[PDB]
Design an enzyme around this catalytic site. Structure first.
Site, PDB file in Angstrom:
ATOM      1  N   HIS A   1       0.638  -1.314   0.615  1.00 56.76           N
ATOM      2  CA  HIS A   1       0.506  -0.108   0.329  1.00 56.76           C
ATOM      3  C   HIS A   1       1.014   1.322   0.690  1.00 56.76           C
ATOM      4  CE1 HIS A   1      -3.769   2.684   1.275  1.00 56.76           C
ATOM      5  NE2 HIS A   1      -2.729   2.372   0.701  1.00 56.76           N
TER       6      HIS A   1
ATOM      7  N   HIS B   1       1.912   5.268  -2.517  1.00 55.04           N
ATOM      8  CA  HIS B   1       1.256   6.275  -4.178  1.00 55.04           C
ATOM      9  C   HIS B   1       2.635   6.849  -3.953  1.00 55.04           C
ATOM     10  CE1 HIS B   1      -2.272   6.045  -2.211  1.00 55.04           C
ATOM     11  NE2 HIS B   1      -2.243   5.685  -0.857  1.00 55.04           N
TER      12      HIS B   1
ATOM     13  N   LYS C   1      -8.545  -1.179  -5.572  1.00 53.00           N
ATOM     14  CA  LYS C   1      -9.312  -0.103  -4.150  1.00 53.00           C
ATOM     15  C   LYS C   1     -10.254   0.086  -4.474  1.00 53.00           C
ATOM     16  CE  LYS C   1      -7.357   2.105  -1.085  1.00 53.00           C
ATOM     17  NZ  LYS C   1      -6.046   3.022  -0.942  1.00 53.00           N
TER      18      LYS C   1
ATOM     19  N   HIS D   1      -9.564   1.087   2.492  1.00 53.55           N
ATOM     20  CA  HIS D   1      -9.284   2.258   2.896  1.00 53.55           C
ATOM     21  C   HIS D   1     -10.780   1.926   4.087  1.00 53.55           C
ATOM     22  CE1 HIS D   1      -8.763   6.897   3.718  1.00 53.55           C
ATOM     23  NE2 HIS D   1      -9.834   6.145   4.368  1.00 53.55           N
TER      24      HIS D   1
ATOM     25  N   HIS E   1      -5.884   0.201   6.578  1.00 50.89           N
ATOM     26  CA  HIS E   1      -5.617   0.467   7.069  1.00 50.89           C
ATOM     27  C   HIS E   1      -6.304   0.453   8.686  1.00 50.89           C
ATOM     28  CE1 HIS E   1      -4.802   3.785   4.207  1.00 50.89           C
ATOM     29  NE2 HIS E   1      -5.620   4.131   3.914  1.00 50.89           N
TER      30      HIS E   1
ATOM     31  N   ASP F   1      -5.074   1.526  12.391  1.00 53.97           N
ATOM     32  CA  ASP F   1      -5.656   2.649  13.687  1.00 53.97           C
ATOM     33  C   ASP F   1      -6.918   2.184  14.285  1.00 53.97           C
ATOM     34  OD1 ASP F   1      -4.448   4.735  12.165  1.00 53.97           O
ATOM     35  OD2 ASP F   1      -5.789   4.840  10.518  1.00 53.97           O
TER      36      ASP F   1
ATOM     37  N   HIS G   1       0.140   1.222   7.148  1.00 49.70           N
ATOM     38  CA  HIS G   1       0.658   3.360   7.607  1.00 49.70           C
ATOM     39  C   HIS G   1       1.282   2.937   8.743  1.00 49.70           C
ATOM     40  CE1 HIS G   1      -3.945   3.563   9.058  1.00 49.70           C
ATOM     41  NE2 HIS G   1      -3.480   4.994   9.562  1.00 49.70           N
TER      42      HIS G   1
ATOM     43  N   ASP H   1       1.837   3.137   2.946  1.00 56.16           N
ATOM     44  CA  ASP H   1       1.427   4.943   2.795  1.00 56.16           C
ATOM     45  C   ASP H   1       2.504   5.918   2.236  1.00 56.16           C
ATOM     46  OD1 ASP H   1      -0.920   5.412   1.617  1.00 56.16           O
ATOM     47  OD2 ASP H   1      -1.870   6.152   3.412  1.00 56.16           O
TER      48      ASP H   1
END
Ligand SMILES: C[As](C)(=O)[O-]
Ligand SMILES: C[As](C)(=O)[O-]
Ligand SMILES: [Zn+2]
Ligand SMILES: [Zn+2]
Ligand SMILES: [Zn+2]
Ligand SMILES: [Zn+2]
Ligand SMILES: [Zn+2]
Ligand SMILES: [Zn+2]
Ligand SMILES: [Zn+2]
Ligand SMILES: [Zn+2]
Ligand SMILES: [Zn+2]
Ligand SMILES: [Zn+2]
Ligand SMILES: [Zn+2]
EC number: 3.1.8.1
Lengths: 331, 330
Positions: free
Chosen positions: A22, A24, A136, A168, A197, A200, A221, A268
């Protein structure tokens, strides 16, 4: 499923090697980089920055990243192809839709969105012939009526092609449970799905229940933290105030519960980021100067120090991503 | 000013001729034509359709159209340049933002948006060197905070470059009053501004109050009507239940009140339309087979028959657009 599509073409499963699942190149909006490159300094500056990052991640042992930018998150697959070639890092491109569909997408039916995702996987993205290798999708709490369509279309496209789906979530709202429900309603295998994610939450049982059902858990992340700059509300909202070590210890947690095979790990990271506040990239780069190298340079050693077997780390960073990315039709 | 920028480069003010001031090649979203052309059959099919339409408009006397598709409304300036060349119709491209800005736009400051509109007027659109000749902006009822910024940046760009601003309104909600207030707070002349979709009102006082202040009034979607398609909820929301003749009578009303010089007329036609319900283009093309030729073929003779002097019709379709589009610094 003997080949994984990348922006340079198909690669064998063994060619993938250490994979960040994951990432970008540039978090943006459709068309934005083409229309306003000076927002990133220039297109060339952004490319040069990406290549420097990718090269340093390569140096730390990264062989492949999965760029999970969609059409509405500003994916520019010709930039991906360029930097992949310059840096000699494989990049897997995504289809799907993220949290910011424009009208021409928001108004579409489930059947229409299915055809779109299938186009990007089977025909290619735009006029490049670059075929997406993942789909995604996104919720942030309870799914909107449209996000329900997007999830169902992603399940349909994944069942047709075997390419995995990755999500996400707002992990504090336990979105993974509704996403799983909708996916399973369409008959998708949980082993085709990464609930992202997920680092979290500290609600360990939410993760374990999903893992036990066969889902991949995206602890994706890890370097995100605003510890040290919590005055900055926009960065706090994005990065959170849990430490990277807290995030990283969930990897150990799930391992300790018997789910090493269900874990995917990533940074991330991005090299540009227009879909948030101005200069958020500078803030992030000061938080995590390692960028995409943070996983190999910091996280893998931290876990080994905490007792996690290196072979287990290798299973997480090489085997799990190869299994997940391998296109896999149901029986 | 002395030149108007088009997708083929600069034209002289006399070269614009009969001009439709609010049109689209393709009402879409940023990137959407490039990513999913099969939505329109294909890019080739969409282009061929646009060229047919534009050639028939040209036969009817149309020399220039203003394509008011912004970045967020799917403007693909390469398509525009292609079909302008193939059909031999001048097309003016737009900058600005319409009613669907993505995050990367929505999160920007007024100073950032100003720089983006200037880039598209002064530099060029994308990597093409094609410079916008108009700035399009939008409200649908009272302005949101972001929309205030968009209007302020539009005003600042128009003051800097002299290119006009043209608006989308919900005319039922008298949006032109707030838009005007904003533009004036920035010091922009009203003669730089067209208050669009104004043919959706019957409140002639709203229109005369604006015309009196020096605004241009965009009576810009004359063929839009869902009379006879009352069963089609989405078509009725878009098209309305007032006839084309009712829309067109507003032109005569404004002429009669003394404001011929303030009127701009157009079809608001498109050759593709992805930013709305599926198949809306089929429904609209049935309603109005003439497409962008509707104004010259139907509207101008309708008005002539009602008493409107042809010299007046010529001032509306040639003189007013020329004066509007001519870049004009304070
Ligand atoms: C582009 As993101 C912050 O949802 O990974
Ligand atoms: C694209 As429109 C219906 O606001 O003119
Ligand atoms: Zn290789
Ligand atoms: Zn996300
Ligand atoms: Zn988070
Ligand atoms: Zn992401
Ligand atoms: Zn070991
Ligand atoms: Zn000419
Ligand atoms: Zn409009
Ligand atoms: Zn209307
Ligand atoms: Zn009134
Ligand atoms: Zn329009
Ligand atoms: Zn006469």
């Amino acid at each position: 499923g003997d080949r994984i599509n990348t922006v340079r073409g198909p690669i064998t499963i063994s060619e993938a090697g250490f994979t960040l699942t994951h990432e970008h190149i540039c978090g943006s909006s459709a068309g934005f980089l083409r229309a306003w490159p000076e927002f990133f300094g220039s297109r060339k500056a952004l490319a040069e920055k990406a290549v420097r990052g990718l090269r340093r991640a390569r140096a730390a042992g990264v062989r492949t990243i999965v760029d999970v930018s969609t059409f509405d998150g500003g994916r520019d697959v010709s930039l991906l192809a360029e930097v992949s070639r310059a840096a000699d890092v494989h990049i897997v491109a995504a289809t799907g839709l993220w949290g910011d569909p424009p009208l021409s997408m928001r108004l579409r039916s489930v059947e229409e969105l299915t055809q779109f995702f299938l186009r990007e996987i089977q025909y290619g993205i735009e006029d490049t012939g670059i075929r997406a290798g993942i789909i995604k999708v996104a919720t942030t709490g309870k799914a909107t009526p449209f996000q329900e369509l997007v999830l169902k279309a992603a399940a349909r496209a994944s069942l047709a092609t075997g390419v995995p789906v990755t999500t996400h979530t707002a992990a504090s709202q336990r979105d993974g449970e509704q996403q799983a429900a909708i996916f399973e309603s369409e008959g998708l295998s949980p082993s085709r799905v990464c609930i992202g994610h997920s680092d979290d939450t500290d609600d360990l049982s939410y993760l374990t229940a999903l893992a036990a059902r066969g889902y991949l858990i995206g602890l994706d992340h890890i370097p995100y933290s605003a510890i040290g700059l919590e005055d900055n509300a926009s960065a706090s909202a994005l990065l959170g105030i849990r430490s990277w070590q807290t995030r990283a210890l969930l990897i150990k947690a799930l391992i300790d519960q018997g789910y090493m095979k269900q874990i995917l790990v990533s940074n991330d990271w991005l090299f540009g980021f227009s879909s948030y506040v101005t200069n958020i990239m500078d803030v992030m780069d000061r938080v995590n100067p390692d960028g995409m190298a943070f996983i190999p340079l910091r996280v893998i050693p931290f876990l080994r120090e905490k007792g996690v077997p290196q072979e287990t780390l290798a299973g997480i960073t090489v085997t799990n991503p190869a299994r997940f990315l391998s296109p896999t039709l149901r029986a």
